[PDB]
């Protein structure tokens with residue numbers, strides 16, 4: 056309920072302050088990750104396979120900076136809003152919501 | 167005491183919900199017009215003129 | 220299946236509750252007689268003869 | 273010793289087993305028992321392997337009952353293969369209750 | 379946390395209609411509970427709108443019903459929705475009881491025993507309503523049923539005259555019946571809530587009669603949409619009655635105003651009372667007949683004690699199945715005999731069907747369960 | 757006896773036509789939601 | 805009142821499910837449906853039908869007899 060409510064909140068009504076926090080967390084994550092010969096080497100090897108180039112840190116910055124609340128709400132809507140999830144459950148899972156009721160969490164009736 | 171809800175976050179949240187609030191207003195108005203067969207509006211809808219004379 | 224409740228303990232428990240069950244029977248009978256003003260019994264109670272003729 | 277009468281007695285028992293039709297859902301006899309207090313205690317006492325097998329058999333049967341379907345004939349429980357796995361647990365539970373009931377008499 | 383889960387009012391709705399663990403495998407036959415609830419609200423709404431125009435005096439009761447059907451805007455649909463809704467109510471009652479019988483749902487002692495009270499309360503409700511339009515069948519039906527009480531030794535005459543308010547069914551009787559008929563469905567609604575409370579202690583039984591804790595689904599969306607479909611099938615069957623055959627289940631003598639001086643030659647109940655009517659007139663004694671009639675409904679309260687099988691449901695029980703269907707067909711026979719004159723073949727067969735009704739329940743079905751146990755080495 | 761006769765039957769047609777739409781559609785709605793269950797597969801995988 | 809999480813103990817059961825948007829509402833509706841109803845009819849006929857036929861026979865006899873009882877032929 057709380058997980059899906061957050062997806063729905065971000066799809067419909069992402070505000071600006073929290074998007075800035077999300078942006079900063081990514082900027083910190085990226086620079087913190089690429090620290091050592093090993094993660095940088097992995098980044099070279101993987102990037103040339105996937106992208107064909109190394110995408111420089113300044114480019115990622117430009118791509119992060121572009122994202123505002125409108126961008127978060129459009130991009131979240133494209134992937135989350137009224138979409139069929141894949142669900143995997145393992146363990147004491149009797150209270151795991153029925154799939155129809157998971158599916159119904161993928162849209163909001165007020166929106 | 168309702169100074170609480172004044173600030174840039176709350177203005178943005180107003181802006182996000184405004185097309186939805188007005189579209190619900192559109193649902194309600196067309197809904198009330200339909201349910202009462204309302205005269206003033208429904209004479210002016212170019213098909214649905216099933217009073218005539 | 221109600222062979223369960225047959226044995227010396229259950230007979231003793233019957234004997235203990237029997238003056239109580241019969242005294243409650245006395246409460247109920249006098250109660251019903253009073254509430255309906257019952258004719259057959261209350262003509263025979265030597266005060267409370269407030270019909271007479 | 274006993275030959276010709278026994279097979280007929282078994283025949284009526286086997287006939288009724290097939291007409292009962294819980295075997296079409298992959299149920300054993302003991303899966304179908306009404307859960308009173310004696311029975312609920314017998315379930316509780318079952319070993320891990322038998323407990324879990326019991327649940328899968330019920331689940332698979334309730335699933336079939338919802339779809340109003342039955343198993344392929346290959347997969348029906350054969351009268352001869354029907355394991356009375358609850359009976360000795362249940363019998364002991366009944367024996368225990370009856371002793372308490374005799375003590376309560378005196 | 380959800381609002382739905384912990385709001386003190388929405389809590390109750392949640393635990394009854396949304397998050398209620400329900401058997402995956404409950405059939406069509408489990409639709410009749412919600413359908414009975416629909417039937418109650420239908421009888422409430424149409425009945426209130428009838429009460430807005432009906433007057434309860436002998437001089438004006440027939441005329442006010444006539445006024446509804448000609449003059450009151452759409453009074454005819456409301457009137458016929460009500461009359462045929464009463465029949466729908468009894469159709470749903472009987473399917474629901476029959477489900478309980480076959481599937482061993484009566485092992486829920488308190489739930490079942492309240493359902494009996496629910497049955498006796500709707501019976502009393504529909505009797506008192508049928509009196510209200512003050513037709514010939516209204517009056518003589520009022521006469522026959524009320525006189526059933528006069529068979530009670532010593533106090534019987536005093537009891538009937540008390541419920542009349544006089545020496546026959548009259549002015550005092552009709553107005554009474556309007557007041558009692560108004561109050562009783564609200565009492566029904568309260569007993570129906572108590573019924574549902576007792577049920578939620580255990581949840582539902584299922585076709586197999588085996589515990590379904592291993593395979594529960596949420597009530598919503600599954601039985602919300604299954605109950606919607608059920609309701610639309612109820613609406614079809616009700617509207618077919620109101621818009622195509624409004625007099626099919628009605629007696630034509632009820633279109634003649636009440637005459638206190640002359641009976642109809644025939645005299646028959648509405649269809650849903652015909653089995654019990656057959657049971658009453660099977661006995662050549664006054665007290666014997668009414669005692670038989672009372673016992674024909676009140677036997678349902680003994681059905682729990684006559685369970686003898688080690689399996690709950692009749693699903694895995696071919697002997698009991700044959701005897702159950704023999705009961706249903708016996709009841710069909712009794713509804714046939716109910717609707718026919720007290721003459722040559724009908725008397726003796728009415729007696730035989732009456733014996734068989736009590737033989738199936740009290741003797742034959744509890745013998746089948748025991749034989750079936752012995753057959754399974756149980 | 758029955759002034760409502762003509763209105764009753766016009767309503768009657770309107771009912772049957774609506775029920776001819778609404779019954780298959782509500783059925784299709786119940787079939788949609790129940791699909792999740794009616795096509796479910798079970799496997800039992802106990803240790804050893 | 806019973807709640808999910810508190811019902812019973814289940815171990816070692818895998819359920820596989822598809823979305824309703826991924827799948828048919830009426831899969832093989834006539835081609836699998838009518839074989840199933842035919843199989844269901846066969847399974848129950850011998851239990852359901854013979855009481856009702858026995859009603860019908862007593863119905864048709866009883867109506868015929870009563871009709872024929874309400875006639876003379878000598879006086």
Ligand code: HEM
Nearest residue numbers: 408410411412414415483484490493494496497570582583
């Ligand atoms: C005022 C009419 C009644 C209403 C509104 C009603 C309400 C319902 C509801 C909503 C259900 C749950 C869904 C279902 O199984 O159908 C139900 C179940 C039940 N009802 Fe009633 N009921 C009434 C009449 C009766 C009668 C006359 C009896 C039988 C004496 C009955 C005995 C039961 C039992 C035993 C169940 C449990 C069924 C099971 O889970 O298999 N009820 N009731």
Ligand code: HEM
Nearest residue numbers: 421422425426428429432461464467504507508510511563
């Ligand atoms: C509290 C809600 C109810 C009210 C206010 C009410 C009121 C009415 C009124 C005013 C009448 C007389 C008009 C008429 O005959 O058409 C009537 C008759 C009737 N009532 Fe009700 N009613 C209620 C619910 C019930 C229920 C629950 C039943 C039992 C299913 C019932 C069964 C009937 C029947 C059979 C008639 C006779 C209909 C006829 O053939 O004309 N009603 N009621």
Ligand SMILES: C[C@@]1(c2ccc(F)cc2F)OC(=O)N(Nc2ccccc2)C1=O
Nearest residue numbers: 501504505508519520522646647648651
């Ligand atoms: C509708 C009816 C009825 C409903 C429920 C009930 F439990 C008994 C009844 F008689 O009320 C009534 O007066 N009749 N008619 C009737 C009763 C006895 C003899 C002849 C007709 C009914 O069928």
